Amino acid sequence: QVQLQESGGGLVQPGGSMKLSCVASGFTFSNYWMNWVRQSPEKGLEWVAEIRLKSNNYATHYAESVKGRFTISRDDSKSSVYLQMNNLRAEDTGIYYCTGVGQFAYWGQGTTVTVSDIVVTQESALTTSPGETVTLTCRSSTGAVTTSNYANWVQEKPDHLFTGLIGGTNNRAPGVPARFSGSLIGDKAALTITGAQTEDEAIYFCALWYSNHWVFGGGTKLTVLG
Amino acid sequence: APDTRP
Ligand SMILES: *[C@H]1O[C@H](CO)[C@H](O)[C@H](O)[C@H]1NC(=O)CF
Fold this sequence. Notes:
The complex is a heterodimer.
Chain A: E1 3-7, E2 10-12, E3 18-25, E4 34-40, E5 44-51, E6 60-62, E7 70-75, E8 80-85, E9 94-100, E10 106-107, E11 111-115, E12 120-122, E13 125-128, E14 133-140, E15 152-157, E16 161-167, E17 171-172, E18 180-185, E19 188-194, E20 202-209, E21 214-216, E22 220-224
Parallel strand pairs in A: 2-11, 13-22
Antiparallel strand pairs in A: 1-3, 3-8, 4-5, 4-9, 5-6, 7-8, 9-10, 9-11, 12-14, 14-19, 15-16, 15-20, 16-17, 18-19, 20-21, 20-22
Chain B: no helix or strand
The complex binds 2-deoxy-2-[(fluoroacetyl)amino]-alpha-D-galactopyranose.
Residues 4-5 of chain B line the site of 2-deoxy-2-[(fluoroacetyl)amino]-alpha-D-galactopyranose.
């Protein structure tokens, strides 16, 4: 079992600053890029920043909306990643998660920060029954999804608990059940549950890579009835 | 292109 544990959130004023931390265990932290992703009720899941390896001179990339305000950093000797947030706006309100590995297998529990273009489209909702085959899809406004978009699929359950299921289009994350599969189908990425189970009732997000950033979809609510 | 280490 991998663990990621975030800390440092709170209740801050517009214009304020804050630093978030995340400490990792159970995997070789220094061999993997790390990311910060935030969830807000209005804007959904939003990728914020990545930091690469020592051998990449710790290269970083940022969402356009935080560029020049946020700084991501890491300390491999403490297995920790940080996000320094300056000039906070109301818009920055959300739950902040550190996440990485192939490419979003592992997620921390999140830390809440309250301050007071490519579109990726998913089905808003789908309804199935136990034992059915259900396929969720992820389309890009740019055109076709290909293997160069490295489609990831992540599952959210109560309460704001995330786990990665699929990365690199069709690679199952370790310990992910066999009933989950990733594919490319008619120029969309797709997640298939072959024999849905009641516990699969959840929100499913896709993420697509465009050269030096991730764009998350809006999520699909999957209901499993009967 | 992203982190494709397994
Ligand atoms: C991951 O595969 C991608 C292409 O899909 C690139 O070849 C990266 O360099 C690969 N990274 C690694 O093998 C490092 F783990």
